[PDB]
Design an enzyme around this catalytic site. Sequence first.
Site, PDB file in Angstrom:
ATOM      1  N   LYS B   7       0.833  -1.184   0.000  1.00 16.76           N
ATOM      2  CA  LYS B   7       0.000   0.000   0.000  1.00 16.76           C
ATOM      3  C   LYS B   7       0.874   1.244   0.000  1.00 16.76           C
ATOM      4  O   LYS B   7       0.685   2.212  -0.760  1.00 16.76           O
ATOM      5  CB  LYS B   7      -0.937  -0.022   1.221  1.00 16.76           C
ATOM      6  CG  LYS B   7      -1.911   1.179   1.197  1.00 16.76           C
ATOM      7  CD  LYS B   7      -2.955   0.986   2.291  1.00 16.76           C
ATOM      8  CE  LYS B   7      -3.597   2.275   2.728  1.00 16.76           C
ATOM      9  NZ  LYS B   7      -4.116   2.168   4.149  1.00 16.76           N
ATOM     10  N   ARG B  10       2.462   1.776  -3.509  1.00 17.44           N
ATOM     11  CA  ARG B  10       1.515   2.328  -4.509  1.00 17.44           C
ATOM     12  C   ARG B  10       1.276   3.805  -4.271  1.00 17.44           C
ATOM     13  O   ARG B  10       1.258   4.647  -5.168  1.00 17.44           O
ATOM     14  CB  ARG B  10       0.182   1.556  -4.394  1.00 17.44           C
ATOM     15  CG  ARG B  10      -0.972   2.217  -5.140  1.00 17.44           C
ATOM     16  CD  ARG B  10      -2.133   1.309  -5.313  1.00 17.44           C
ATOM     17  NE  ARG B  10      -2.794   0.997  -4.058  1.00 17.44           N
ATOM     18  CZ  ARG B  10      -3.637   1.755  -3.365  1.00 17.44           C
ATOM     19  NH1 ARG B  10      -4.117   2.944  -3.744  1.00 17.44           N
ATOM     20  NH2 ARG B  10      -3.995   1.347  -2.147  1.00 17.44           N
ATOM     21  N   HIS B  12       3.062   6.123  -2.281  1.00 17.24           N
ATOM     22  CA  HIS B  12       4.183   7.050  -2.087  1.00 17.24           C
ATOM     23  C   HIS B  12       5.491   6.812  -2.828  1.00 17.24           C
ATOM     24  O   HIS B  12       6.375   7.688  -2.665  1.00 17.24           O
ATOM     25  CB  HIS B  12       4.592   7.015  -0.544  1.00 17.24           C
ATOM     26  CG  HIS B  12       3.419   7.382   0.313  1.00 17.24           C
ATOM     27  ND1 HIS B  12       2.841   8.614   0.260  1.00 17.24           N
ATOM     28  CD2 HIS B  12       2.710   6.666   1.239  1.00 17.24           C
ATOM     29  CE1 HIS B  12       1.820   8.661   1.089  1.00 17.24           C
ATOM     30  NE2 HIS B  12       1.707   7.536   1.677  1.00 17.24           N
ATOM     31  N   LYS B  41      -8.442  12.151  -2.955  1.00 19.95           N
ATOM     32  CA  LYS B  41      -7.634  12.108  -1.694  1.00 19.95           C
ATOM     33  C   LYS B  41      -7.049  13.523  -1.639  1.00 19.95           C
ATOM     34  O   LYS B  41      -6.510  13.982  -2.676  1.00 19.95           O
ATOM     35  CB  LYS B  41      -6.539  11.058  -1.788  1.00 19.95           C
ATOM     36  CG  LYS B  41      -5.780  10.994  -0.429  1.00 19.95           C
ATOM     37  CD  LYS B  41      -4.672   9.950  -0.539  1.00 19.95           C
ATOM     38  CE  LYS B  41      -4.077   9.584   0.809  1.00 19.95           C
ATOM     39  NZ  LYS B  41      -2.606   9.288   0.599  1.00 19.95           N
ATOM     40  N   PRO B  42      -7.237  14.222  -0.550  1.00 19.10           N
ATOM     41  CA  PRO B  42      -6.814  15.600  -0.431  1.00 19.10           C
ATOM     42  C   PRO B  42      -5.305  15.852  -0.527  1.00 19.10           C
ATOM     43  O   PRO B  42      -4.965  16.832  -1.184  1.00 19.10           O
ATOM     44  CB  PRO B  42      -7.367  16.069   0.907  1.00 19.10           C
ATOM     45  CG  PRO B  42      -7.626  14.818   1.684  1.00 19.10           C
ATOM     46  CD  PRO B  42      -7.915  13.728   0.673  1.00 19.10           C
ATOM     47  N   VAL B  43      -4.519  15.023   0.112  1.00 19.00           N
ATOM     48  CA  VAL B  43      -3.041  15.200   0.154  1.00 19.00           C
ATOM     49  C   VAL B  43      -2.280  13.908  -0.028  1.00 19.00           C
ATOM     50  O   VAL B  43      -2.690  12.811   0.408  1.00 19.00           O
ATOM     51  CB  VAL B  43      -2.720  15.843   1.535  1.00 19.00           C
ATOM     52  CG1 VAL B  43      -1.335  16.431   1.621  1.00 19.00           C
ATOM     53  CG2 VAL B  43      -3.793  16.866   1.938  1.00 19.00           C
ATOM     54  N   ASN B  44      -1.037  14.024  -0.575  1.00 18.93           N
ATOM     55  CA  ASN B  44      -0.227  12.798  -0.742  1.00 18.93           C
ATOM     56  C   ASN B  44       1.180  13.228  -1.198  1.00 18.93           C
ATOM     57  O   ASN B  44       1.285  14.290  -1.794  1.00 18.93           O
ATOM     58  CB  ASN B  44      -0.860  11.863  -1.742  1.00 18.93           C
ATOM     59  CG  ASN B  44      -0.226  10.500  -1.836  1.00 18.93           C
ATOM     60  OD1 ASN B  44      -0.174   9.779  -0.838  1.00 18.93           O
ATOM     61  ND2 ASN B  44       0.241  10.072  -3.007  1.00 18.93           N
ATOM     62  N   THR B  45       2.121  12.401  -0.846  1.00 17.60           N
ATOM     63  CA  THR B  45       3.561  12.666  -1.188  1.00 17.60           C
ATOM     64  C   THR B  45       4.099  11.425  -1.897  1.00 17.60           C
ATOM     65  O   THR B  45       3.834  10.290  -1.492  1.00 17.60           O
ATOM     66  CB  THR B  45       4.429  12.956   0.084  1.00 17.60           C
ATOM     67  OG1 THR B  45       3.884  14.057   0.827  1.00 17.60           O
ATOM     68  CG2 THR B  45       5.920  13.194  -0.213  1.00 17.60           C
ATOM     69  N   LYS B  66       3.644  11.069  14.531  1.00 17.97           N
ATOM     70  CA  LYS B  66       2.612  12.045  14.883  1.00 17.97           C
ATOM     71  C   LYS B  66       1.742  11.564  16.018  1.00 17.97           C
ATOM     72  O   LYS B  66       1.308  12.425  16.819  1.00 17.97           O
ATOM     73  CB  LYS B  66       1.806  12.530  13.688  1.00 17.97           C
ATOM     74  CG  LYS B  66       2.594  13.657  12.956  1.00 17.97           C
ATOM     75  CD  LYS B  66       1.986  13.954  11.603  1.00 17.97           C
ATOM     76  CE  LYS B  66       2.812  14.801  10.688  1.00 17.97           C
ATOM     77  NZ  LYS B  66       3.325  16.034  11.328  1.00 17.97           N
ATOM     78  N   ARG B  85      -1.307  18.400  -3.453  1.00 17.50           N
ATOM     79  CA  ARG B  85      -2.355  19.002  -2.619  1.00 17.50           C
ATOM     80  C   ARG B  85      -3.598  19.313  -3.474  1.00 17.50           C
ATOM     81  O   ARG B  85      -3.510  20.103  -4.409  1.00 17.50           O
ATOM     82  CB  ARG B  85      -1.901  20.278  -1.946  1.00 17.50           C
ATOM     83  CG  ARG B  85      -2.841  21.105  -1.087  1.00 17.50           C
ATOM     84  CD  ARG B  85      -3.237  20.553   0.208  1.00 17.50           C
ATOM     85  NE  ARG B  85      -2.124  20.260   1.130  1.00 17.50           N
ATOM     86  CZ  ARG B  85      -2.373  20.052   2.436  1.00 17.50           C
ATOM     87  NH1 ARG B  85      -3.608  20.200   2.954  1.00 17.50           N
ATOM     88  NH2 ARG B  85      -1.411  19.682   3.265  1.00 17.50           N
ATOM     89  N   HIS B 119       3.801   3.533   6.584  1.00 17.37           N
ATOM     90  CA  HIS B 119       3.112   4.817   6.737  1.00 17.37           C
ATOM     91  C   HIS B 119       4.054   5.988   6.472  1.00 17.37           C
ATOM     92  O   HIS B 119       5.204   6.005   7.003  1.00 17.37           O
ATOM     93  CB  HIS B 119       2.554   4.976   8.189  1.00 17.37           C
ATOM     94  CG  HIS B 119       1.369   5.895   8.211  1.00 17.37           C
ATOM     95  ND1 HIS B 119       0.084   5.509   7.825  1.00 17.37           N
ATOM     96  CD2 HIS B 119       1.351   7.204   8.576  1.00 17.37           C
ATOM     97  CE1 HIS B 119      -0.664   6.619   7.973  1.00 17.37           C
ATOM     98  NE2 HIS B 119       0.064   7.645   8.401  1.00 17.37           N
ATOM     99  N   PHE B 120       3.549   6.920   5.693  1.00 15.10           N
ATOM    100  CA  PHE B 120       4.278   8.163   5.414  1.00 15.10           C
ATOM    101  C   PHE B 120       3.849   9.172   6.485  1.00 15.10           C
ATOM    102  O   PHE B 120       2.675   9.626   6.461  1.00 15.10           O
ATOM    103  CB  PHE B 120       4.019   8.655   3.987  1.00 15.10           C
ATOM    104  CG  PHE B 120       4.878   9.859   3.679  1.00 15.10           C
ATOM    105  CD1 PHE B 120       4.460  11.145   3.937  1.00 15.10           C
ATOM    106  CD2 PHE B 120       6.160   9.609   3.140  1.00 15.10           C
ATOM    107  CE1 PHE B 120       5.287  12.240   3.672  1.00 15.10           C
ATOM    108  CE2 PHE B 120       7.004  10.694   2.870  1.00 15.10           C
ATOM    109  CZ  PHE B 120       6.557  11.998   3.148  1.00 15.10           C
ATOM    110  N   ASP B 121       4.718   9.546   7.399  1.00 10.17           N
ATOM    111  CA  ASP B 121       4.410  10.466   8.512  1.00 10.17           C
ATOM    112  C   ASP B 121       4.464  11.910   8.111  1.00 10.17           C
ATOM    113  O   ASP B 121       3.484  12.684   8.293  1.00 10.17           O
ATOM    114  CB  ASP B 121       5.217  10.061   9.739  1.00 10.17           C
ATOM    115  CG  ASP B 121       4.841  10.801  10.986  1.00 10.17           C
ATOM    116  OD1 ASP B 121       4.162  10.257  11.861  1.00 10.17           O
ATOM    117  OD2 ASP B 121       5.205  11.978  11.093  1.00 10.17           O
TER     118      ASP B 121
END
EC number: 4.6.1.18
Lengths: 124, 124
Positions: B7, B10, B12, B41-45, B66, B85, B119-121
């Site tokens: 996941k 895919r 990040h 999806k509002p945000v992603n890197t 976080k 964004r 997880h991308f923090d």
Amino acid sequence: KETAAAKFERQHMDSSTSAASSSNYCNQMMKSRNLTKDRCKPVNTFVHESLADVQAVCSQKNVACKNGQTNCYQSYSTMSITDCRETGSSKYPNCAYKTTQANKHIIVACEGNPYVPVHFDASV
Amino acid sequence: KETAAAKFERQHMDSSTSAASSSNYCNQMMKSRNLTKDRCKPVNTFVHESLADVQAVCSQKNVACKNGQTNCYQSYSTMSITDCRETGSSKYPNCAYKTTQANKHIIVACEGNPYVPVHFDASV
């Protein structure tokens, strides 16, 4: 008790310094702002700009917030920010952080009348 | 049925490009990665480094996530990342994104054996 606007100011505003002085800035600031009172707040960002400049962001670039709401705004200009991240050796009540000084655009969530920042979304 | 690691990949990893191609990068990738599927999806890197270099962060600098737990790692070096964004104008199913290319430190949450990013923090 405390206003959302007043809460953002206590947690994220530091207009009295242009930048993180030393490597100990976070240790000192996380503690003086009460973010270390019942637990070590893991992450926090301080903004070294006047309130006026920060409030002005509420009328700059509109973007989605992390959670999907659309009352987020990104500064057109970069700002002096201080990144505080709890280290792997911190143990309450001796909260320990990594201080990172940088110039980055900020994203805040604005609300109320007047329309001011009430939430720190991210720095980019 | 993807693993938490698959996941992460895919969502990040963008090893095939050294940097955000253009201002349309985010619109394209958000879509092809299925992040525009039932909602925007509002945000992603996206991280533009080999999978090997990103998995390696799991043995780099230990930091608090976080959420306060200490299975987060901060990369020693800066890495090529693209910030996506959702803009104020975006409307499902025609999701619109603002693309930001930068060289920053990454913070990921790690889990399992082998111990890899799940997880991308944040980026700092």
